[PDB]
Every structure is written in C-alpha cells, then in structure tokens.
Design a protein around this ligand. Structure first.
Ligand SMILES: [Zn+2]
Ligand SMILES: [Zn+2]
Lengths: 197, 130, 552, 340
C-alpha cells in the first residue's frame, strides 16, 4: 500500500534520532536513504498519474460526485502521507545538521545529500554572519555551560608548537600542563588539543 | 639455502639468418658474447632487431596477462562465464598468470634494459608507466 | 608604501583578536612571522594607524576560508593567500584532451545507484613499474559494471517505470512470461544464452522477432521478452531489442550532475567534483560566441609510407596553412603494414622505418608555419601503429590502446607547437561539449559477427551502427574473447553520459554525420578512397559538419 | 641529387633496352632510389672503407650467375626475385603447388596475417595463443656423471619432422596444404641429394619461412603445427635414445647430452657411432644431422650456463661465479678445479 514506504523511512528517522540522542557526543549522522526516498517519490509520481488519469476520465464522469470524489480523496491523502513522511525525515536530519553547525563549524560528509551539503554550507555562512555583524562582542557560537572558573589547569594532549595569544604565547609541548585563563584556551579544548575541564 | 641468483629472460626461437640457426637465447643466464652474436657461426646480431624481439616478448606477456582465463582458487575449475562473482564451489576466482609473476617479468626487463643500454626497450618500459 | 614598522610581537594582539577571537584560526609563530611581513609590506606604518590592520586581517581570514589549508597559519598557507589575491574566460583554460590512462575512473555502485571515484594507482609511486597493470579483481567486475549501468539506464526509461526480472528469478517458474536484460553469451556447449549478475539461461531464438534498427552481436546487452520453459530449461524469446539509449542531459542530471572529466575541476576520494551549472551556462554562451573555431578531421589509414598519401596530404595542408584549424585530428594506422619485430637484419628494421615515416611527416609540417603554431595536433593510433602491432600483427587487439611511443614522436614534437598523442578511445573536453574520438572499423565486425535470426543500404547500415553503439552505451559491445579490454580502463570505453559529439571513425562504412538522442556522430571514413583524398570539418560553435575532398 | 637523374637518363640514351640494372645493397634507400631513378628501366632490386664497394663491383658476375641459377631453377624472372629472402621463392613455389592441387590460397600482400578473408582482422583466443606461444619443454637432469657423456648435436629437426609427419580439430593447419608442403619438401630434398645447390639452399632456408611473418603465405597455424610437431619429435628422439639403454642429461631443439652407461671414451668411440647410427636408421629420424660434438669423461651439470667437466681438457663455465663478489670469483674457480 502507498503509505508503507513512508513508515519504513520514518522508522529510519526514529532510529537515527535515537542514535544521536543516546550518546554524549555529536554522532556523525548516517547515510541519506536515497533508495527509499526514490521509491517514495516514484510512488508520488504514480499517484500524480492516477489523479491525472482520473481527472481526465471525470469527463466521462462515472458516478463522479461520490465515486470519483472518493477515489481522488484517497489518492490525494496518500500523497499527503508521503509528503509528511519525507518532510519528517528531512527535518530531523536538518535539525541534526543545524546542531552540528553550532556545536562545531560556527567556532562523514559522504552521508549527506548534496542538497544537504550545500544547505549546511549556507547555514554555516549564516551563523558566521550572526557572529560578525552587530552582537559580535559575544561569540554567539561559544559554550553554553556557564563559566565556572576564570583560571584552569589544562594538560596538552597533542603537540602544536609555539603559538601566540593576545599578549603572549603557548608552546604546546606534548604532556606539558598549563595554569591559564580559560577564555584564552577554550578554542583549543574544543579543537581537542587540550585535555582538562 | 641456495636459490639460483639468475632470473632467466629467454627470447624463444631467435633466428640467425647467416646460418639459419633457431636458438632460444637467455639475456640473463647467457654470457654477453652469446647474446650479441651467434653460437654456431659468430656473426653479430643487429641491436635494434634484438630490442624489437625483446619488446615483442614484453608485449606478448602483457597481452597474455590481460587475455588470461581465471581459475577457481580451490577446485581449480576454469571460469566459464562472464559475470559470476565467485565459483559455485564457494571459492574466489584467481588468475592463471598471477600478477606477481608479471611484475617480476617487468622487473627483469627493466634490469636487462638498463644494463645492456637498450634505449628503445627502455623507452617502452618507461611509456608503460608514464 | 611607507617603510615597514610592523613586527610579530606588536601585531600579535590584533592578529589574535581577528583570526582567533572571531574565526578560531590559530596563530602559529612561524606563520605569524610570514603574516606580519606580508601585512607590514602592504600597510607600511605601525598597526595603530586606523582600520587598515583589521581590514587586511579580515581579507586574510576570508582568503584562508577559501583555501581551507588547516587550523593553524603557516608560511605556505600565507603564500597560498597571496596566490589567491594575485588571481583576484579563455577557452584554452577549458579545452583539454583526455587520454584513456588519464581519465578519472569512477566505479558504479548499484546499491546506492551512483558513481564513486577511484584513484589511479599510477600515482602510488610503488607503481613506478607495474603501476599500470590491472588487478584480477578488475576483470571479475568488468562486465558487472556494464550490466549495472545498462540496467540503471533501462529503469530510468519511461516504458518500464512491465519490468525486468533477473535471470536467476526464472528458475522453477515454469511456462510464464518474463522480460529479461542480459549479456548475449554463446555458451561453452555452443547454445545461445543470456547472462545476468544473478545467473544465465539458454535461449531459443527460432520464433523471435528482433527489433530492426539494431545489430545484435555476442556480448551485447539485449532486452528479451519470452516464455521460460523448465522442460528443457530454455527461454523462448518472443522479441528482442537493445535497451533504449538515454539523452545526455537526462543522464547527467539524474546521476547527480558530476564532472566526470575535470572540465570544471578534479575529483578526490573525499570529494566528487560537481559540474557547476552557472559556469556551464557561461561556457555554453562562450561556445556559441566563438563562430570562427573549427575542428578538422582527417580520414583513417593515413599511411605515411605511400608517396601518393603524402602528396595528397601536402595539398590539404597547403590549404590549411591559409586559414588554420583550431584543431587537427590525425588518425589511424600511420604505416601500410603493421610494424612488428623484423625477421632479418638486411633491410632497415621495421621500428626504424616507423621512425623514418614520422621524420618525413615532421619534414612536411616544417613547411607550414600558421598550421604548426595555431592548431592543436592530435594523433590517434590504429591497428598498424607500433606497440599494438608488435603482438597483434595488425589485427585489432587490446582496445584502450596506448598512445604511439615517444621514441618515434621526437621530430614531430620539435616542430609542432602543440601535440597530443592519445589513446585510440581518446576524449576531447571542449567548452561544454564532451567529444569522443574512436578509430576501429566497427561496421565490419558487426556484420561479420551479428546474430542471424530465423523466422538506401548505406543509410540503413550506418543508422544500424550508431543506433547500436549509443543504445548499447559503450564503444565495444563485444565479448573480451572477441575484443580484449584492459580491465582497469574499460571505464573509458563506456559512454554513460552520452557524448555531445562523437568522431566514430570507421574504415569500412560510408562517411556520415548522423544525429541520435542529440549525440552528433560523424564518420570521416578512409583518408584515400576512389582516387579522392577526404577530410571532415566539424564546426563546434554550430555543430555543422562540412565534408571536404581533393581529387588525387 | 639531380646528377642521378642525369646519369640514369644518359644511360637510357646509350641503352634504351638491352641492358640490365643492378640497384642496391644492405644500406638501402630503395624507394627514394626509385624516385631519383627513371622508373622505366628493368631493375634487379637488391638489399677510407672503399674496399667494400670495390668488392661488391667485382662480386657482380658471381651474383648474376647465382641469380640466373635461381631463376632457371625456380621459374621466376630475374628482376622480380630477391636474393635477400629465399622465403619469397619458397612462397611462389608453394603457391604454385597449392593451386595446382586446388587449395584456396591464403596469400596476403598487404599484411603478415594469413588472408582468410575478413576474419583475420579480429582477435581470437586460439589465434592469440597460437601467435604468443613458443617454448620447448626442455629437459635438464642435473647431476654429477662419472659415465662418459655424449654431447649430441642435432640439426634438420624441422625438415625431418615435416618429412616424417603422419572439423574435429580447430587450430591444426590444413591437412591438404601440409601434404603439399611434405611432398614438395621431399622433391627439394631429392634435388639437394643430387646437389642442386639452389635446392639445398632452399631446404636449409625452410626453417625461416615457416616462422617469418613477412612470408607471403605465412600462417600462424602453420608455424604452430610445425612447432608442436618439432616438440613431439624431440621427445620421440629422447624416447629412442633412452630405449637404447642410455639416459638423457639435457635436451633442447639444438642439442642433447646423454649418459652412456659406459666409463671410458677410448672404449666408447665405436659404441657412440653405433648408437647414433641405430637412431638415424629408425625412419622417424631419417634426416637428422646427429653429430657427436663433444665427449665428456666426467661432467658436473646444473644447466647449460653452469657446468664443468673433463673432455676427450678441463673446462669450467658458471653464471653462478658472476654473482659472487670480485675477491671470491678467483676463489670459486680455484676450488672448482680442486673439486674436479
Ligand atoms: Zn649464426
Ligand atoms: Zn571452484
């Protein structure tokens, strides 16, 4: 029946939402199901051809006020259902992409559809526009854990040599440990070079 | 353990026209005088002719690799069809001329070409890769 | 510009406050030395002199985002920013010849119904020798890939979405109608047969009605309707047809609009290059703008070792030097005999004679200045050219054939400004037109091998030729036992996004310039035929095809 | 180069006819020569170091004698045949006999391949195997041999097998054409026994023609049919020698080394000639040039590039030696002499 592929697609949606929700990290989302989506879009085209065929044969008009009305209603509702299933899948994966944009890129690519790849590019461009115009005094993409401490100890987890900061340097020697202002190192904790807190 | 230090590179049925002598000559195991000249009479062989025969052998082996039959790796039946992924006895298909042997043949060809200064054969070997 | 008064310990706060505080880019010290001298050589005075500091740092960060070279600034990245700033249409930038060995390989995945890039391991360095050799795995996947591309194309055709059943579904479903898609085998037992990725079945053609606009040969992908019979395990063919071709644009958009040539940019294993629609439109407008350009194609079997050929050719070139082509395709068997290992040393040896012919040809080209410095020479080998001839003895052999060896090009290469010795199935990528060129004498092979069903001539046979090739989607429909293919390079013989034009040079059929599914297919035929020298002037900016001749 | 046309025209004015022109020698420029030369002559085509030139000049009369002998034998005109390729004479003569025995002739002018019609243009797996394959299954029984060993040279194996030779089989050469080649070779052989020097030169050159792709009647199936018959006969020759109680150290298409079951050459100079005669008196090997080329008293053998022995006087050759470093190559030879 015309709705079954929609159920299979949104079961895929439910499983990938759980795959994202259960883990503490941002898990890189799974492959875009082009095959099931092609099957559903083909089903939509079948339903469109059915409506065209019926609306042509309404000029012959077989009990049309009830029978053709009912046939048209059912084949229209099948298309509404399949639109809902497709949009549910795409809106979920869109939400995950937006979450990933804020969590990383505002500071696995094969799995996206090419529309989703260019969508993500545009949404990252939008985020970087927000933290560039007005309100730029706040890095709007920064952390949402409240600042617990102004100075922290941080252990260098990967080597990165001598780099500057606003009035000094760090030499990121492997398994050296700093005691430093948190606001000067947060970028490197997010990039995974520094360990603690 | 003793393994023979010489890899044979034989050109079969080479002809000395000056005495109609049909010799297989081995560019690695033969002494250089027996390569560049006959061994019944002792007239010298033309260098470009000799390089041509080595190129004919080289291309013969590249073709013989590409046209080979595949064989089943455990029951040794020949692959009789065009689109099976494995033999019906569960075994994977393998070449009857495994790729390693052909790399070895090309290696002796590059050695022979470098040593005897065979410019044309060396250009052929170079044009395979590049 | 004022003398430089900017240094890293002074620029440090502002470099951080832009790159790090805004964009997360990390100020590595050597990279900051390079950045500070670049900034200082542009600004001159001290960093405190107004917005010029943050303006330039914003420009640096933007260009860094264009090049994307990493999370830390470094001097090579600074030089990359400089290069992008220096670059802040010419048809040479887009026209290019693409050999078989140079063409980006894409495997086709049927489960995901899409192409995937495969790197050429000639790059691998360990392949400095035997880097070209195919693996055994390339052989077992060869015919599977042809089937999957064909089956995929069939499914996109409106007539099917009754539909195909794979051959292995037949077994045990007695006396029932089925539609098959199959590789046309002849079994080891001798009976005609179809094969599928799932299996094969023997066929009876004794009652069949083939569709008439096609040749049918062994190894061809053929649609077959019929009734399966378990009693002899035969399939009784009602009717047969080649799978319908698919127009270029229809193919390109549905495969995802890939750049399978690098006409817009090179692909990588992490990044499939995309055929940008805007640039495609700009290039097509330019392609329509260049009224003057002209591709000239000489006929096949241009034997340089016949004086009559050289005499005729000197007349043709003496016209072309008045008004040079954009491009000049030479092609096909540049020696009368195939050149193979000479049996005896008394005569000048066969390889030597092959070199002397290109000495003579280079001597001809020396007389023609306008031609040699404005055309692009393209040479396309045939059955009599050199390392192919060594082992085939002039028969048609291993098909994605090598360019003629550089030991014999040398004098040509010194006189001609531009030359490309290219594989026999070479490709031109023009502004938007992909153009295949191929030199094979297919027509003889088809008629010599076509299936003989029980139960004007020139136009009919040439329509049968091109319709076979383009519906079949692939330049060599024959089994490898009838035409061996280098297994790695079979992807170059496939045509799946059908080319915009095809120079399908065939020595054994009339000259023609048909159009089919928007593909314009031209055969210039034999160079010297019926006391006339013959050549063909393809006009890319209008797709006309003015044939030309000289009496001799 | 205008002098060449001037000289040839002056020759034509001194002799419009009644003179014959001898063209060229192996540093050929033949086609360009025909461009400078007036093409209308009747021409015998031919393919401080001036001694070479004078020797050719004074060779001319013997060349004309040899060419007249070739023409009078072969029934071919003087200008058309080439001294440079006996294969072409063999081609025209074989073609004559084939058509006289009513075989459709596979002569090819344009390409090496046998003209079977259009089908020779196509690749074929049998054809490619036929063309690619040549190697003898050469025997090499390594060891020490305190027996005397006979170094039997061989020749005429091709000729002997063509003579002693004798669809369901699809890469065998046509049996009719093979019968014509056999009978014609018997004809040539008989005329060589009667010392037609041209016939002997022909029979000696047959081994080229069955392999030369430039032969007008070249056929891959013919080359292969001859080759694998040669293989089979070499194995039968080994079978005969072993059937006479001897044992084979080595064998290939040009040579056989045989363990005798005897201990001293001075005892065996009679027995060896008995053995060789006993082979050649078998009809299968009637025409072989069996030749006892060396007598070995003691032989150390691993391959024909790595052996040593005493001959009837000590010889040593080792490709093994060549791979030792230089300080040890003299050492190896010294210890080889000590071991011998
Ligand atoms: Zn010799
Ligand atoms: Zn098996």
């Amino acid at each position: 029946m015309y709705g079954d592929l929609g159920n299979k697609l949104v079961l895929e949606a439910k499983r990938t939402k759980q795959l994202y929700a259960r883990s503490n990290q941002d898990v890189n989302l799974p492959m875009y199901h082009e095959d099931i989506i092609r099957n559903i879009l083909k089903e939509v085209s079948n339903l469109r051809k059915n409506t065209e065929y019926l609306k042509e044969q309404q000029q012959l008009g077989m009990l049309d006020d009830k029978v053709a009305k009912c046939q048209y209603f059912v084949t229209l509702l099948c298309m509404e259902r399949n639109k809902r299933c497709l949009l549910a899948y795409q809106r979920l994966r869109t939400d995950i992409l937006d979450s990933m944009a804020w969590n990383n890129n505002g500071l696995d690519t094969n799995n996206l559809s090419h529309q989703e790849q260019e969508y993500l590019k545009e949404y990252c461009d939008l985020i970087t526009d927000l933290k560039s115009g007005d309100l730029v005094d706040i890095d709007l993409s920064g952390s949402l854990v409240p600042p617990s401490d102004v100075f922290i100890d941080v252990r260098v987890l990967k080597d990165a040599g001598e780099i500057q900061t606003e009035y000094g340097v760090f030499n990121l020697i492997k398994d050296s440990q700093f005691f430093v202002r948190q606001s000067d190192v947060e970028r490197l904790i997010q990039q995974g070079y520094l360990q603690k807190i | 353990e003793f393994k023979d230090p010489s890899l044979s590179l034989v050109v079969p049925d080479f002809l000395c026209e000056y005495c109609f002598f049909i010799s297989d000559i081995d560019f690695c195991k033969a002494a250089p005088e027996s390569i560049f000249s006959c061994v019944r009479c002792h007239k010298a062989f033309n260098q470009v002719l000799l390089q041509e025969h080595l190129i004919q052998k080289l291309r013969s082996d590249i073709e013989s690799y590409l046209i080979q039959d595949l064989r089943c790796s455990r029951c040794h039946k020949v692959k009789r069809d065009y689109m099976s992924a494995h033999c019906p006895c569960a075994g994977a298909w393998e070449g009857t001329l495994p790729r390693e042997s052909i790399v070895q043949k090309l290696n002796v060809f590059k050695q022979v070409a470098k040593y005897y200064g065979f410019d044309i054969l060396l250009s052929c070997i170079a044009d395979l890769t590049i | 510009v004022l003398p430089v008064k900017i240094q890293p310990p002074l620029l440090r706060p502002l470099a951080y406050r832009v790159l790090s505080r805004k964009y997360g880019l990390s100020i590595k010290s050597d990279g900051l030395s390079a950045l500070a001298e670049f900034v200082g050589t542009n600004i001159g005075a001290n960093w405190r002199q107004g917005p010029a500091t943050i303006k330039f740092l914003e420009q640096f960060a933007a260009v860094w985002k264009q090049q994307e070279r990493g999370l830390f600034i470094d001097q090579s990245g600074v030089k990359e920013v400089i290069q992008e700033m220096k670059e802040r249409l010419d048809w040479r930038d887009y026209f290019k010849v693409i050999n078989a060995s140079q063409q980006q390989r894409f495997s086709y995945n049927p489960h995901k119904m899409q192409f995937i890039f495969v790197p050429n391991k000639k790059q691998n360095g360990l392949g400095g020798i035997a880097g070209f050799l195919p693996d055994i795995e390339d052989k077992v996947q060869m015919f599977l890939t042809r089937y999957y591309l064909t089956n995929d194309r069939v499914m996109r055709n409106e007539n099917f979405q009754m539909s195909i059943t794979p051959i292995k579904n037949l077994l045990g479903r007695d006396a029932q109608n089925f539609l098959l898609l199959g590789l046309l085998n002849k079994n080891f037992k001798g009976n005609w047969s179809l094969e599928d990725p799932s299996g094969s079945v023997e066929i009876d053609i004794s009652q069949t009605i083939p569709t008439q606009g096609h040749y049918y040969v062994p190894g061809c992908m053929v649609l077959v309707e019929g009734i399966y019979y378990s009693v002899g395990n035969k399939f009784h063919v009602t009717s047969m047809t080649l799978p319908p071709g698919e127009r270029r644009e229809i193919t390109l958009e549905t495969i995802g609009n890939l750049d399978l040539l690098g006409i817009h940019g090179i692909s990588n294993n992490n990044f499939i290059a995309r055929l940008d629609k805007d640039l495609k439109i700009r290039l097509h407008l330019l392609e329509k703008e260049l009224t003057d350009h002209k591709f000239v194609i000489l006929g096949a079997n241009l034997f340089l070792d016949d004086l009559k050929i050289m005499t005729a050719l000197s007349k043709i070139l003496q016209k072309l030097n008045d008004d040079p082509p954009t491009l000049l395709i030479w092609q096909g068997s540049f020696t009368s005999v195939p050149v193979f290992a000479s049996m005896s040393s008394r005569n000048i040896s066969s390889s030597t004679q092959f070199k002397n012919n290109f000495d003579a040809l280079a001597t001809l080209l020396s007389r023609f200045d306008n031609l040699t410095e404005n055309t692009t020479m393209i040479f396309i080998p045939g059955p009599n050219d050199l390392w192919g001839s060594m082992v085939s003895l002039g028969a048609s052999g291993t098909l994605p054939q090598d360019p003629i060896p550089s030991a014999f090009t040398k004098k040509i290469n010194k006189v001609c400004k531009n030359v490309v010795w290219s594989s026999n199935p070479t490709r031109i990528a023009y502004l938007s037109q992909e153009i295949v060129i191929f030199r094979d004498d297919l027509s003889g092979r088809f008629k010599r091998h076509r299936l003989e069903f029980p139960f004007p001539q020139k136009v009919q046979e040439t329509r049968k030729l091109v319709k076979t090739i383009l519906d079949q989607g692939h330049l060599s429909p024959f089994l490898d036992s009838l035409r061996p293919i280098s297994w790695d390079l079979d992807h170059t013989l496939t045509l799946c996004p059908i080319p915009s034009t095809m120079v399908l040079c065939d020595t054994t059929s009339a000259q023609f310039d048909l159009t089919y599914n928007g593909c314009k297919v031209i055969n210039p035929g034999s160079f010297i035929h019926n006391r006339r020298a013959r050549y063909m002037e393809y006009v890319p900016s209008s797709k006309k095809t003015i044939q030309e001749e000289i009496y001799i | 180069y205008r002098r060449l046309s001037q000289e040839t025209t002056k020759l034509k004015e001194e002799r419009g006819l009644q003179f014959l022109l001898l063209l060229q020698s192996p540093f050929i420029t033949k086609l360009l020569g025909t461009i400078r030369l007036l093409n209308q002559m009747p021409i015998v085509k031919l393919s401080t170091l001036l001694k070479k030139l004078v020797n050719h000049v004074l060779s001319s009369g013997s060349w004309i004698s040899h060419l007249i002998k070739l023409s009078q034998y072969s029934n071919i005109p003087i200008c058309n045949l080439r001294l440079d390729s006996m294969d072409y004479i063999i081609d025209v003569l074989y073609a004559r006999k084939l058509k006289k025995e009513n075989i459709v002739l596979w002569w090819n002018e344009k390409a090496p391949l046998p003209d079977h019609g259009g089908i020779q243009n196509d690749f074929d797996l049998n054809t490619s195997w036929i063309m690619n394959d040549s190697e003898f299954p050469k025997i090499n029984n390594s060891g020490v041999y305190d027996n005397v060993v006979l170094d039997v040279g061989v020749d005429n194996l091709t000729v002997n097998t063509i003579l002693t030779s004798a669809e369901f089989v699809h890469d065998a050469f046509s049996n009719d054409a093979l019968n014509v080649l056999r009978g014609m070779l018997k004809e040539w052989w008989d005329e060589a026994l009667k010392e037609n020097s041209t016939a002997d030169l022909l029979v000696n050159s047959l081994a080229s023609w069955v392999q030369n792709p430039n032969a007008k009647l070249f056929d891959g199936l013919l080359r292969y049919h001859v080759h694998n018959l040669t293989k089979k006969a070499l194995l039968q020759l080994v079978n005969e020698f072993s059937a006479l109680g001897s044992t084979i150290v080595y064998a290939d298409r040009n040579q056989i080394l045989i363990k005798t079951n005897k201990y001293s050459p001075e005892n065996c100079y009679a027995y060896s000639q008995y053995m060789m005669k006993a082979v050649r008196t078998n009809p299968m090997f009637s025409y072989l040039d069996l030749n006892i080329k060396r007598y070995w008293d003691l032989l150390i053998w691993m391959d024909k590039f790595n052996f040593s022995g005493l001959a009837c006087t000590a010889v040593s050759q080792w490709q093994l030696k060549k791979f030792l470093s230089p300080i040890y190559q003299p050492e190896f030879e010294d210890w080889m002499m000590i071991i011998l």
